[PDB]
Tab-separated table of N, CA and C and ligand atoms in Angstrom:
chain	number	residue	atom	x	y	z
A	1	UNK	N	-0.068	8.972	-5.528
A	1	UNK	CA	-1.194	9.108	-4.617
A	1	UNK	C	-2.222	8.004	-4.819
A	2	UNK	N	-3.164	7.695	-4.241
A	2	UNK	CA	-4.039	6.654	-4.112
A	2	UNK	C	-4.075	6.111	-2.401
A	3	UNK	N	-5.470	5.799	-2.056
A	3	UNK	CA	-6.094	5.196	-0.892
A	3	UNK	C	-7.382	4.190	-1.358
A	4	UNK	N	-7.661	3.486	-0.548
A	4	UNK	CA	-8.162	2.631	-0.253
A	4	UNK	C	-9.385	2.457	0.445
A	5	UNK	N	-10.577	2.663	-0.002
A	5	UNK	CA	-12.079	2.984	0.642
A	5	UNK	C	-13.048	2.159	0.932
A	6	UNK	N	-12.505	1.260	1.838
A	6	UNK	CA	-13.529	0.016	2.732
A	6	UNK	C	-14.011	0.522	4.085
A	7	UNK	N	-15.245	-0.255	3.840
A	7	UNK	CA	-16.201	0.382	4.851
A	7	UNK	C	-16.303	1.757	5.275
A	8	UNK	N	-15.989	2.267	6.766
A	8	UNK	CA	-15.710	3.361	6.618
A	8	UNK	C	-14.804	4.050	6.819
A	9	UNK	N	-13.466	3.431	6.756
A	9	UNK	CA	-12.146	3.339	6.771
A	9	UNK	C	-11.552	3.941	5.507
A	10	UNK	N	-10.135	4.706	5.224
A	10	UNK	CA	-9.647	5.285	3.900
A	10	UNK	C	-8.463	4.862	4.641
A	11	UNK	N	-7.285	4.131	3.255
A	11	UNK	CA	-6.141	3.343	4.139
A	11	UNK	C	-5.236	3.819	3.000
A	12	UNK	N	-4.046	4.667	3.466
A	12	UNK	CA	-3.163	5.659	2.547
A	12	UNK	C	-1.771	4.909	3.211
A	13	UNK	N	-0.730	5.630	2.566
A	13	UNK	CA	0.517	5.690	2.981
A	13	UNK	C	0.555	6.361	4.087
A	14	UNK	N	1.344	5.973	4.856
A	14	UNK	CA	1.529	6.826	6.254
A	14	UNK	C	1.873	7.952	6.252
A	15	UNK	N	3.078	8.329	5.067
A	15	UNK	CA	4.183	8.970	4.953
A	15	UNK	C	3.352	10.146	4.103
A	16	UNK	N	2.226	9.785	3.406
A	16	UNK	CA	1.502	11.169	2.754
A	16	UNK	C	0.162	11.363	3.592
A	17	UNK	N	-0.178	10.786	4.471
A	17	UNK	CA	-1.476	10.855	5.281
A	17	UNK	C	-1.321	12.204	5.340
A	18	UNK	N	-2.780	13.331	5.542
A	18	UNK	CA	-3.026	14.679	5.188
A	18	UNK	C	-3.734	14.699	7.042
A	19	UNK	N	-3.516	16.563	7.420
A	19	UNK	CA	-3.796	16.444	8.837
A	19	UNK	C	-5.356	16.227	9.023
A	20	UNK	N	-6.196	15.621	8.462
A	20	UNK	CA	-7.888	15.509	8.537
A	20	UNK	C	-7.472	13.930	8.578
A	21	UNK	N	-6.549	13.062	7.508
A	21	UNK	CA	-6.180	11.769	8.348
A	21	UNK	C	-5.866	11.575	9.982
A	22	UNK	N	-4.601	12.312	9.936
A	22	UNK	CA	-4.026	12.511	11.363
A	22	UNK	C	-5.476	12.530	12.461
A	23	UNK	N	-6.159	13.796	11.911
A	23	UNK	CA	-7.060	14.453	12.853
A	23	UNK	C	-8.116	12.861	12.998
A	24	UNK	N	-7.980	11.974	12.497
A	24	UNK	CA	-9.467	10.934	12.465
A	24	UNK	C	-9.146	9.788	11.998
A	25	UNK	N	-7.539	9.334	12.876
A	25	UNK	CA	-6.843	8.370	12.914
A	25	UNK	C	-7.491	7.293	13.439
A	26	UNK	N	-7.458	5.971	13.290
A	26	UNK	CA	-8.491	4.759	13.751
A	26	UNK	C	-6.318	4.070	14.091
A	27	UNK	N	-5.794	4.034	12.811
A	27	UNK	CA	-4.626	2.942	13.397
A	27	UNK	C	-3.515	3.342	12.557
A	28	UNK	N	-2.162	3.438	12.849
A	28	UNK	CA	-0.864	3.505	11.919
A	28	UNK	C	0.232	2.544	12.783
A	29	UNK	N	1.199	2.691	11.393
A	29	UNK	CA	2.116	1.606	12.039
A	29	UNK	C	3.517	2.162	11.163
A	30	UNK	N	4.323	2.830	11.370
A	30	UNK	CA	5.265	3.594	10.835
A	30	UNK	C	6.565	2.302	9.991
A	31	UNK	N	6.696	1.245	10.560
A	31	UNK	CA	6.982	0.318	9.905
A	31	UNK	C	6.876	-0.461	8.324
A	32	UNK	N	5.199	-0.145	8.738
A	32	UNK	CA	4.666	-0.604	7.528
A	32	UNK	C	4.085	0.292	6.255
A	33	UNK	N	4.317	1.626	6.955
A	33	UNK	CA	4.140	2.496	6.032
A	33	UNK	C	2.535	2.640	5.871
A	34	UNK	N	1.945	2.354	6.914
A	34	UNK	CA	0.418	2.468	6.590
A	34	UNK	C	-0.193	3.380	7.680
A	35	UNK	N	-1.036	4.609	7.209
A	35	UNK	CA	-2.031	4.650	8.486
A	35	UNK	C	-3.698	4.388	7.942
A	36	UNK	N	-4.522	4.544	7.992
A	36	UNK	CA	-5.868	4.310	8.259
A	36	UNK	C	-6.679	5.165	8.559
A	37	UNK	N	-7.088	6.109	8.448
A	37	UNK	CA	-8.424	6.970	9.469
A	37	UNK	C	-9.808	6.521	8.810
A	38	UNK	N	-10.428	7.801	9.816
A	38	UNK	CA	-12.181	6.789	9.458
A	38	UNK	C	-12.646	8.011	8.660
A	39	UNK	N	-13.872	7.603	7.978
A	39	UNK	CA	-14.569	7.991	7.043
A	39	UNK	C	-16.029	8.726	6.864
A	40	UNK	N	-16.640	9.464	6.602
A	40	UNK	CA	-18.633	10.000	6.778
A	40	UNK	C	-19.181	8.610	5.997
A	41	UNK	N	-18.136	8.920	4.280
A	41	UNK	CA	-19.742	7.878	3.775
A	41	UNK	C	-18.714	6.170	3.507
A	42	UNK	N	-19.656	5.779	3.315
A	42	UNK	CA	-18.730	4.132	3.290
A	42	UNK	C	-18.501	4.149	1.856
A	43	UNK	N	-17.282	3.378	1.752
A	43	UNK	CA	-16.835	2.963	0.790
A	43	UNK	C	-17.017	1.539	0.078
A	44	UNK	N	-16.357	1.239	-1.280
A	44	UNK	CA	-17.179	0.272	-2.705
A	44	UNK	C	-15.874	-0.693	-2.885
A	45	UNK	N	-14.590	-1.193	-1.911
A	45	UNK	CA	-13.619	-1.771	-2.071
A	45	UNK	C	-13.523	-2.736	-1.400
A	46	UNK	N	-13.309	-4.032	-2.242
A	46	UNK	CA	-13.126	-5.140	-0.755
A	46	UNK	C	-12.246	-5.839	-0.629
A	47	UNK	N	-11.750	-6.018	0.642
A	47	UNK	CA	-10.054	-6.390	0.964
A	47	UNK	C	-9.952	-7.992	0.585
A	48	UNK	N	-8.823	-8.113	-0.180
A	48	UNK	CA	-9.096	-9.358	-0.461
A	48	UNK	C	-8.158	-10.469	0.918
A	49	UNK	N	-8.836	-11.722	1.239
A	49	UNK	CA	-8.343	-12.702	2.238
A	49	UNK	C	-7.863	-14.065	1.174
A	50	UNK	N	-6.679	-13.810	1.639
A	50	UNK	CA	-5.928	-14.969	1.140
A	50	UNK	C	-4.295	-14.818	0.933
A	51	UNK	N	-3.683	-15.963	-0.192
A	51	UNK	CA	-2.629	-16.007	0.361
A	51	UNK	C	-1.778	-15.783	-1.416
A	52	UNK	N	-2.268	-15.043	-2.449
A	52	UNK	CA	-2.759	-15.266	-3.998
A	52	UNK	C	-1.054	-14.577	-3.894
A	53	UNK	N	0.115	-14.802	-4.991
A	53	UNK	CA	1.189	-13.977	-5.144
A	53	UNK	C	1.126	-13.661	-6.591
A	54	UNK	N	-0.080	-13.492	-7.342
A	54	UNK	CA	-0.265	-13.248	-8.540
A	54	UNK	C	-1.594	-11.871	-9.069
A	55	UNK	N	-0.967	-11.152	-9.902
A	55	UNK	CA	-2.322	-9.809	-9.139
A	55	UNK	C	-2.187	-8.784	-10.284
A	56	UNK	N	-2.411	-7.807	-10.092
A	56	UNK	CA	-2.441	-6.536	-11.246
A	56	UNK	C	-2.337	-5.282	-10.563
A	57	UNK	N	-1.456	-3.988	-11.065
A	57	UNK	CA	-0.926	-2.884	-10.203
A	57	UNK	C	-1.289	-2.216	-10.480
A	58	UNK	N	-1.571	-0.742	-10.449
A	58	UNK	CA	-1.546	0.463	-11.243
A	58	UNK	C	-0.307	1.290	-10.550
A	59	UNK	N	0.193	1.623	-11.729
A	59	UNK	CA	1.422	2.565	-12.353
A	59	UNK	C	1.313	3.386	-13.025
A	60	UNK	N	0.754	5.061	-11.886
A	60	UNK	CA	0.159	6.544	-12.169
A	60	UNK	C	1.340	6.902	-13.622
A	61	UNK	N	2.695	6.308	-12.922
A	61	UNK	CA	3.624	7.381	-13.794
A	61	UNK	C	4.045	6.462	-15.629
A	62	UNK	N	2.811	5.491	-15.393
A	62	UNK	CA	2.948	4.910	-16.780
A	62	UNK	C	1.525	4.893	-17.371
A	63	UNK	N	0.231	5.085	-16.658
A	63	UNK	CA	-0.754	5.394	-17.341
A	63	UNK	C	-1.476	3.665	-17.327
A	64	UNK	N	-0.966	3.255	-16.138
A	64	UNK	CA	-1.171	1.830	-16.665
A	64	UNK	C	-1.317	1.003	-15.940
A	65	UNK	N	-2.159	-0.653	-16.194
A	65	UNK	CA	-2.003	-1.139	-14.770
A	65	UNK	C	-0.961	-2.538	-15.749
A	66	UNK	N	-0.518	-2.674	-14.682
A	66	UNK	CA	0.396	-3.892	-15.323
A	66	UNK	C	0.293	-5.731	-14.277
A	67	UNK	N	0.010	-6.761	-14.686
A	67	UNK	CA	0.213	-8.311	-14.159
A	67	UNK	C	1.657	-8.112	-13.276
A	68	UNK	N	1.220	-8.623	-12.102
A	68	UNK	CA	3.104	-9.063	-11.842
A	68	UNK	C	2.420	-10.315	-10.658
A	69	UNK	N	3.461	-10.779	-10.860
A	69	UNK	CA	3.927	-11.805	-9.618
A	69	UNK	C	4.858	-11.182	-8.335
A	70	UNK	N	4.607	-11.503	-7.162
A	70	UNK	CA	4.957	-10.427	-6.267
A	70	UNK	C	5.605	-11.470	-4.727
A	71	UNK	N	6.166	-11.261	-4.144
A	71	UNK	CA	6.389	-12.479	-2.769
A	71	UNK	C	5.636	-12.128	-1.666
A	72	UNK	N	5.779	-13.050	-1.106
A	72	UNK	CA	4.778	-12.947	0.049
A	72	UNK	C	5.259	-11.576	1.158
A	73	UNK	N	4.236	-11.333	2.023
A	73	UNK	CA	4.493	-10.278	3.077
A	73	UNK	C	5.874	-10.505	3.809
A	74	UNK	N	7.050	-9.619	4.217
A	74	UNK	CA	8.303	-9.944	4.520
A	74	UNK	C	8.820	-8.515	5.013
A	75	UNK	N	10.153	-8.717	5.964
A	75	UNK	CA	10.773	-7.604	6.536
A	75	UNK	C	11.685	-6.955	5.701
A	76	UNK	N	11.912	-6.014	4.593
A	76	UNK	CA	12.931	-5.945	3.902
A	76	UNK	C	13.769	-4.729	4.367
A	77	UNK	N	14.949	-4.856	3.998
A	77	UNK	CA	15.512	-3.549	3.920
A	77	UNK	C	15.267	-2.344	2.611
A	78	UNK	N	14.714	-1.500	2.310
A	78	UNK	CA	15.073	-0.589	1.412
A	78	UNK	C	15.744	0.208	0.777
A	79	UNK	N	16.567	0.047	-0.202
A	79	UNK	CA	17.390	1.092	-0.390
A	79	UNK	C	17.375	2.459	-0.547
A	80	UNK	N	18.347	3.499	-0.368
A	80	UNK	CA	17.992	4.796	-0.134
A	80	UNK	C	18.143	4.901	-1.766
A	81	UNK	N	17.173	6.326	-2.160
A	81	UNK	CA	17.070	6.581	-3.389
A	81	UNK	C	17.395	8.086	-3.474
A	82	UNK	N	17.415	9.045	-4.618
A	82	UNK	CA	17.206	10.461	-5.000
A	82	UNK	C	16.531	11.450	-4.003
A	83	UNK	N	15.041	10.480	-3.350
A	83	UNK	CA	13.842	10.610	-2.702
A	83	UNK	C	13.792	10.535	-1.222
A	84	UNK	N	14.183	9.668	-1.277
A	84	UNK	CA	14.081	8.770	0.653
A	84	UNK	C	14.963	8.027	1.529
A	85	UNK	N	15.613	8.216	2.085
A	85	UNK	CA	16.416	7.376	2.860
A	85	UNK	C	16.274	5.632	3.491
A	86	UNK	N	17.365	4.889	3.155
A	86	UNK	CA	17.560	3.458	3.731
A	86	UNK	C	16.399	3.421	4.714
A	87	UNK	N	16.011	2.064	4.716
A	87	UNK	CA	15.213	1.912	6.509
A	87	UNK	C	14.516	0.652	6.071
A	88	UNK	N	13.817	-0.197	7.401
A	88	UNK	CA	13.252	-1.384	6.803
A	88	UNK	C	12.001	-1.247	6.817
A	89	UNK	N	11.341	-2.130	6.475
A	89	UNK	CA	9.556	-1.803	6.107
A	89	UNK	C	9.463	-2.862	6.065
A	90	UNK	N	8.086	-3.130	6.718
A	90	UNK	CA	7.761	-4.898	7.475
A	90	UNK	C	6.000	-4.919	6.611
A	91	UNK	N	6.026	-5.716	6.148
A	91	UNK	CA	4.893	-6.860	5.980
A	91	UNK	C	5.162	-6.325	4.358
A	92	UNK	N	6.200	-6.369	3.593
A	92	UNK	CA	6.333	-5.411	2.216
A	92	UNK	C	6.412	-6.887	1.686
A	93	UNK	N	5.621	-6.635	-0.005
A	93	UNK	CA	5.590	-7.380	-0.818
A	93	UNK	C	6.425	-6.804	-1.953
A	94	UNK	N	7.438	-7.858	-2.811
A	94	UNK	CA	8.044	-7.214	-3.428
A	94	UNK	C	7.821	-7.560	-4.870
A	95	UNK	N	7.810	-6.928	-6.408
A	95	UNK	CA	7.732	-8.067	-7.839
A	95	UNK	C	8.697	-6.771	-8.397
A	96	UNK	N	8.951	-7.035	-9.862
A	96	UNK	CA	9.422	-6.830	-11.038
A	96	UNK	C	8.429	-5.820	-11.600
A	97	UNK	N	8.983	-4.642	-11.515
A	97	UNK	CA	7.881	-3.502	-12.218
A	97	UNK	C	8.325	-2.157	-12.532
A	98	UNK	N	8.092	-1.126	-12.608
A	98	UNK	CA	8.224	0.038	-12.356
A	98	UNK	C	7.535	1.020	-11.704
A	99	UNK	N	8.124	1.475	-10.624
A	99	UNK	CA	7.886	2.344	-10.043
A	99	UNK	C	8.695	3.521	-9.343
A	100	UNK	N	7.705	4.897	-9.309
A	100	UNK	CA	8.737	6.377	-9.224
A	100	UNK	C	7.459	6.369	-7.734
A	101	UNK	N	8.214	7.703	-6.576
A	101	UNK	CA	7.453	8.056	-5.840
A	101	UNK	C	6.450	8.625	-5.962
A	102	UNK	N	5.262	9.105	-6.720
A	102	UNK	CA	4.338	9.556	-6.659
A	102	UNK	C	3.201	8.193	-7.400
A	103	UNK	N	3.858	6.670	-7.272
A	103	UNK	CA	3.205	5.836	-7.415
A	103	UNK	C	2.898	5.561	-6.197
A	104	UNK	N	3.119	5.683	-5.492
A	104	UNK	CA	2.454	5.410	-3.806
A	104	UNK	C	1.314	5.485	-3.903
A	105	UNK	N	0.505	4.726	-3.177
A	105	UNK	CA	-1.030	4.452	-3.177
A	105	UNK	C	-1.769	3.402	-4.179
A	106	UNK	N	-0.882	3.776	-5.600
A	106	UNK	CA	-1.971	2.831	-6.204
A	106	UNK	C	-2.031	1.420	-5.852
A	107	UNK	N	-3.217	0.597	-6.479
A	107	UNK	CA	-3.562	-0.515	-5.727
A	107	UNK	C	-2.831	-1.759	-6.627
A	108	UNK	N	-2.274	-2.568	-5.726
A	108	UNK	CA	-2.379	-3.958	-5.916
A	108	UNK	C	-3.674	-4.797	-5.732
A	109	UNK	N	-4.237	-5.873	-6.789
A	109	UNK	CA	-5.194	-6.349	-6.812
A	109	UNK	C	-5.204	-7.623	-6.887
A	110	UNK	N	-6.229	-8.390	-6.708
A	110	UNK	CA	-5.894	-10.591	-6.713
A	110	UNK	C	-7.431	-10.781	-7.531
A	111	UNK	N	-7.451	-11.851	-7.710
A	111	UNK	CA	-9.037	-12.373	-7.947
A	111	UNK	C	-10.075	-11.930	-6.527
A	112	UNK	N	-9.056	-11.836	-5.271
A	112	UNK	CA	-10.066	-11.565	-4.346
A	112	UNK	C	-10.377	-10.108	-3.784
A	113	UNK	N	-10.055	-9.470	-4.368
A	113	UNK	CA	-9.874	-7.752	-4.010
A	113	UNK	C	-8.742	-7.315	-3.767
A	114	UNK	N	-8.888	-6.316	-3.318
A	114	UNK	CA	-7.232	-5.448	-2.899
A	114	UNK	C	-6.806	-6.093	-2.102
A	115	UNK	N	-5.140	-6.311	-3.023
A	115	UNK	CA	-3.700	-6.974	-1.555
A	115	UNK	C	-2.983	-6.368	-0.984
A	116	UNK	N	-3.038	-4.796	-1.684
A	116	UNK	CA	-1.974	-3.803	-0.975
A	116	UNK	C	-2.181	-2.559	-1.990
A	117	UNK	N	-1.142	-1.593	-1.182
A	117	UNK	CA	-0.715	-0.592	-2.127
A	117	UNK	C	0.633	-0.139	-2.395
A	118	UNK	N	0.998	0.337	-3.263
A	118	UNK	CA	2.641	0.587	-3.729
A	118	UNK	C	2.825	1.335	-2.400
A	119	UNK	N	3.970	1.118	-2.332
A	119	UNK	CA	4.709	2.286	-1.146
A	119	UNK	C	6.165	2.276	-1.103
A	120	UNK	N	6.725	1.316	-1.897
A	120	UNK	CA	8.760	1.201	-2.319
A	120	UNK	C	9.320	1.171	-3.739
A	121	UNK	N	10.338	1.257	-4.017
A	121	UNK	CA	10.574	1.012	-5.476
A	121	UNK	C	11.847	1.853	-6.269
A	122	UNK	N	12.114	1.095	-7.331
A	122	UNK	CA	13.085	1.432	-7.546
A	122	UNK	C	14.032	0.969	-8.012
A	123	UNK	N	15.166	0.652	-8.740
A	123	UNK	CA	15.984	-0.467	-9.152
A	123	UNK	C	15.030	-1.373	-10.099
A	124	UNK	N	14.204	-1.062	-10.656
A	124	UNK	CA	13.759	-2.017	-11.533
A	124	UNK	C	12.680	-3.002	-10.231
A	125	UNK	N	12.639	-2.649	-9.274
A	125	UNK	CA	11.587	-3.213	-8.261
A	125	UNK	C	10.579	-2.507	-7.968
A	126	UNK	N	9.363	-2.910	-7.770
A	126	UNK	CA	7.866	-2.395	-6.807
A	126	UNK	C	7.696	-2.869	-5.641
A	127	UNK	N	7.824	-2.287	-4.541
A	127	UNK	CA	7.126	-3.062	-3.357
A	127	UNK	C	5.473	-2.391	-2.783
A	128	UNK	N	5.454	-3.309	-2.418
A	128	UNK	CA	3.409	-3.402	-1.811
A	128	UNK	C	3.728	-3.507	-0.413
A	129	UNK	N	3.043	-2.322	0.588
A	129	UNK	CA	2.436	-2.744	1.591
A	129	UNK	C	0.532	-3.507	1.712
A	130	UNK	N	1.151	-4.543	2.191
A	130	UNK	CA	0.314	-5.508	2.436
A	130	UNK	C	-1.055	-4.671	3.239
A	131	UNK	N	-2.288	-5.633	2.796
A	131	UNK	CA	-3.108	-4.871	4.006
A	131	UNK	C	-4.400	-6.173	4.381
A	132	UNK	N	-4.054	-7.819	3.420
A	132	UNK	CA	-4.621	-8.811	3.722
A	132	UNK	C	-4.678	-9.356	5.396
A	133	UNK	N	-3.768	-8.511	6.339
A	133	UNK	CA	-4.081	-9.395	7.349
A	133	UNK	C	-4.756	-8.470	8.598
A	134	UNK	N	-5.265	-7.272	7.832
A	134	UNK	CA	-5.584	-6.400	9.048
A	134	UNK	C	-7.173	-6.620	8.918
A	135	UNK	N	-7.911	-7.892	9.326
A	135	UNK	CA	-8.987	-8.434	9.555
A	135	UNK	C	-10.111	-7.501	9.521
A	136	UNK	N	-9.603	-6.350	10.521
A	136	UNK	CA	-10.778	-5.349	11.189
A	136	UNK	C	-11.143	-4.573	10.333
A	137	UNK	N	-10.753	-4.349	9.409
A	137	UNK	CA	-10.806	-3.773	8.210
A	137	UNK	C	-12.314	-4.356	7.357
A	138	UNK	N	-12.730	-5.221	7.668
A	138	UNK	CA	-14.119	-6.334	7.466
A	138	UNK	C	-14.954	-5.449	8.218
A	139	UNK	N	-15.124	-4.972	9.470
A	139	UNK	CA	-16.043	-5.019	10.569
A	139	UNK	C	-15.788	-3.389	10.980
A	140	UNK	N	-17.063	-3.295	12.021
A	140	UNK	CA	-17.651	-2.126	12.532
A	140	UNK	C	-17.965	-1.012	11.796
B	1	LIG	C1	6.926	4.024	-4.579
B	1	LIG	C2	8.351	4.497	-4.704
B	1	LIG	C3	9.046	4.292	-5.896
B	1	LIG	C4	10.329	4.770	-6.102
B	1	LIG	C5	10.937	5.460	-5.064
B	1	LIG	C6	10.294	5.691	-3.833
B	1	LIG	C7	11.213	6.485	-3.097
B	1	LIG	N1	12.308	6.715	-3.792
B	1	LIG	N2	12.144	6.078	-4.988
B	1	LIG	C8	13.217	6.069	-5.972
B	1	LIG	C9	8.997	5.174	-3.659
B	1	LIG	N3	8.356	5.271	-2.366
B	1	LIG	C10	8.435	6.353	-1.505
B	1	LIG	C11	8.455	6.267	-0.069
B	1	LIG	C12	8.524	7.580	0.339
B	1	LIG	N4	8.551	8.358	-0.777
B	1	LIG	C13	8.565	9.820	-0.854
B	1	LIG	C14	9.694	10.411	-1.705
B	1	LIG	C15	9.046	11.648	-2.367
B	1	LIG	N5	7.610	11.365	-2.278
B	1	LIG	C16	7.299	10.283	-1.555
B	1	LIG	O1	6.183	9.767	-1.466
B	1	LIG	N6	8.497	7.611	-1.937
B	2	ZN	ZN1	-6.207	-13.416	-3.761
C-alpha cells in the first residue's frame, strides 16, 4: 500500500483505488496502473521533472528503502505470478530489487522528488509506474 499526496491530488495504484477514490476520480488509465482522485487538504510531496534513472525505493515487505538504478518509462509485458495474471503495462520502469504484492504504492524517489510508485515485480525484478510526465499534477 502507499499513495502519493501532491497538491490536492492522492495518486494510488489503480488496481487498489478504494470506492471514495472511485467516488472523486480527477484521472485513471488502466494501462498504467494508475488512478488519481482529488483531495480536502493539500498535500507535502513534490513530483519530481526530469529524466534521473538513479533513485531510492521503499520495500514495505523488507522494512526498507533500498538505491537502485531503474530504465526509463517503457511498454512491458508482465509476467503472470501466484497473484496476477500476464498483461502489458505502459510507461513501467523497471531495476533489480525485491518486490511481493503488497509493495504496491511505495515510492520511488530522484534528487528531484517522486518518480513513481511500485506496481510489478517479481523474478528478482521491481517495476515503477512512472508519474514524471503527468505535468498537471503541478497545477490547479
Ligand atoms: C508489486 C508486485 C510484486 C510482486 C508481484 C505482484 C503481483 N504478483 N507478484 C508476484 C506485484 N504487483 C501487483 C499487481 C497487482 N497485484 C495484486 C496481487 C495481490 N495484491 C495486489 O496488489 N500485485
Ligand atoms: Zn530526478
Amino acid at each position: 500500500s502507499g499513495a502519493i499526496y501532491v497538491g490536492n491530488y492522492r495518486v494510488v495504484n489503480r488496481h487498489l483505488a478504494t470506492h471514495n477514490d472511485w467516488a472523486n476520480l480527477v484521472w485513471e488509465d488502466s494501462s498504467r496502473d494508475l488512478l488519481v482522485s482529488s483531495t480536502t487538504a493539500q498535500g507535502c510531496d513534490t513530483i519530481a521533472r526530469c529524466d534521473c534513472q538513479t533513485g531510492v525505493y521503499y520495500c514495505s515487505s523488507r522494512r526498507k528503502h533500498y538505491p537502485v538504478s531503474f530504465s526509463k518509462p517503457s511498454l512491458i509485458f508482465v509476467e503472470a505470478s501466484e497473484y496476477y495474471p500476464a498483461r502489458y503495462q505502459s510507461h513501467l520502469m523497471l531495476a533489480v530489487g525485491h518486490s511481493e504484492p503488497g509493495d504496491c504504492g511505495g515510492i520511488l524517489r530522484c534528487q528531484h522528488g517522486v518518480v513513481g510508485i511500485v506496481s510489478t515485480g517479481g523474478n528478482g525484478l521491481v517495476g515503477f509506474a512512472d508519474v514524471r510526465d503527468l505535468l498537471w499534477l503541478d497545477e490547479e
